[PDB]
Design a protein around this nucleic acid. Structure first.
Ligand SMILES: Nc1ncnc2c1ncn2[C@H]1C[C@H](O)[C@@H](COP(=O)(O)OP(=O)(O)OP(=O)(O)O)O1
Ligand SMILES: [Mn+2]
Ligand SMILES: [Mn+2]
Ligand SMILES: [Mn+2]
Ligand SMILES: [Mn+2]
Ligand SMILES: [Mn+2]
Ligand SMILES: [Mn+2]
Ligand code: NA
Ligand code: NA
Length: 324
DNA sequence: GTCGG
DNA sequence: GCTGATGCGC
DNA sequence: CCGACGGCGCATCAGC
């Protein structure tokens, strides 16, 4: 927040490009600029100063000059005043409503929370849940509540089977003092990259979590991925409903998976980019050597996060240092 | 929108 | 009824 | 100056 005013402006521009313009590469360009500036250890005094940084170009330096001169941005004022733009941007804050749905609703005169309720019959299950918990999903979860959630999950998982391993990742693992949601990585000895598929490994855990009334709603559920809603038990003041993601991954790909799901998202983009500049392709699952005509080798042996960093020659960064 | 081809 | 096409979130 | 920029699990539904 040395340069908080500039990164806020870039984020808002990013959001417009994704939600209204449906221009995903521009969205990513703005987030890339906002990230590099956030890293930058000096108060930016001019566009020319920012232009020095990778990810910041001609148009963004011009925008930085204007914000710096006036404290605002003409484009953003116009956009914030534009009815269709403003409304599309708003509806996408509902989980389940993306750029296409929002634009479609707006074309139909649906543009507010109240309009959404009046027309709930036009919403799908995920969207109705998103409406239902609209305010709740916009609150942050403080680390104290995160640690209480960590306890319920690890313990209920134990009760399905003591050999399951559940690891909370995302911002919680990066040590952040508050979190957007809860991300849970799951492994079991019976499920590896070979293992011959066993139904209900994730289902068993999801059903227990439901049984103890921790998980209250399902958004999507399959054999490897559950997205849903959860809520700490109330004695007293009802706790807000939270989003929870659970991913079941093959035991022998656990470190790749832990690297990936700890993030951050920008950090992951940065790592896999740097990976290429060393002859490796990283995904959620494997690190593989690359070569000449684009031949990605077999997965290299990994038994620690750190092992991945070595392959690509980065100093090890503790989870706390990947929040980009 | 930005950068490397 | 089905499934390719597409959206959404990550 | 142009083209690349990450891909995937899951849900829904237009068009047969
Ligand atoms: N767009 C994406 N596509 C694929 N993976 C992603 C994407 N964004 C993030 N990830 C990975 C890296 C993140 O650390 C991890 C968690 O995603 P997510 O829960 O949405 O954000 P986060 O945990 O880093 O912070 P927070 O949830 O508190 O906002 O998933
Ligand atoms: Mn109205
Ligand atoms: Mn998270
Ligand atoms: Mn998440
Ligand atoms: Mn299909
Ligand atoms: Mn162009
Ligand atoms: Mn039909
Ligand atoms: Na630059
Ligand atoms: Na949304």
């Amino acid at each position: 927040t040395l340069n908080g005013g500039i990164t806020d402006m870039l984020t808002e521009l990013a959001n417009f490009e994704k939600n209204v313009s449906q221009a995903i590469h521009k969205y990513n360009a703005y987030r890339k600029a906002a990230s590099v500036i956030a890293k930058y250890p000096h108060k930016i005094k001019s566009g020319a100063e920012a232009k020095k940084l990778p990810g910041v170009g001609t148009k963004i330096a011009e925008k930085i000059d204007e914000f710096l001169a006036t404290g605002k941005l003409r484009k953003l004022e116009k956009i914030r005043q534009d009815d269709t733009s403003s409304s599309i941007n708003f509806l996408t804050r509902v989980s389940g409503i993306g750029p296409s749905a929002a634009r479609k609703f707006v074309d139909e005169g649906i543009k507010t929370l109240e309009d959404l309720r009046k027309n709930e019959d036009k919403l799908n299950h995920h969207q109705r849940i998103g409406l239902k918990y609209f305010g709740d999903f916009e609150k942050r979860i403080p680390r104290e509540e995160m640690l209480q959630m960590q306890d319920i999950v690890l313990n209920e998982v134990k009760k399905v089977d003591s050999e399951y391993i559940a690891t909370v990742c995302g911002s919680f693992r990066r040590g952040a003092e508050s979190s957007g949601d809860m991300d849970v990585l799951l492994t079991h000895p019976s499920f590896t990259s070979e293992s011959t598929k066993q139904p209900k490994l994730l289902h068993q855990v999801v059903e227990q979590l439901q049984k103890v009334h921790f998980i209250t709603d399902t958004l999507s559920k399959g054999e490897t991925k559950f997205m849903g809603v959860c809520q700490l038990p109330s004695k007293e003041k009802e706790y807000p409903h939270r989003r929870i993601d659970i991913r079941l991954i093959p035991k022998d790909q656990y470190y790749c998976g832990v690297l990936y799901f700890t993030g951050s998202d920008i950090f992951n983009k940065n790592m896999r980019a740097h990976a290429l500049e060393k002859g490796f392709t990283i995904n959620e699952y494997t690190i593989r050597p690359l070569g000449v005509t684009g031949v990605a080798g077999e997965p290299l042996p990994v038994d620690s996060e750190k092992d991945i960093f070595d392959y690509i020659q980065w100093k090890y960064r503790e989870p706390k240092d990947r929040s980009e």
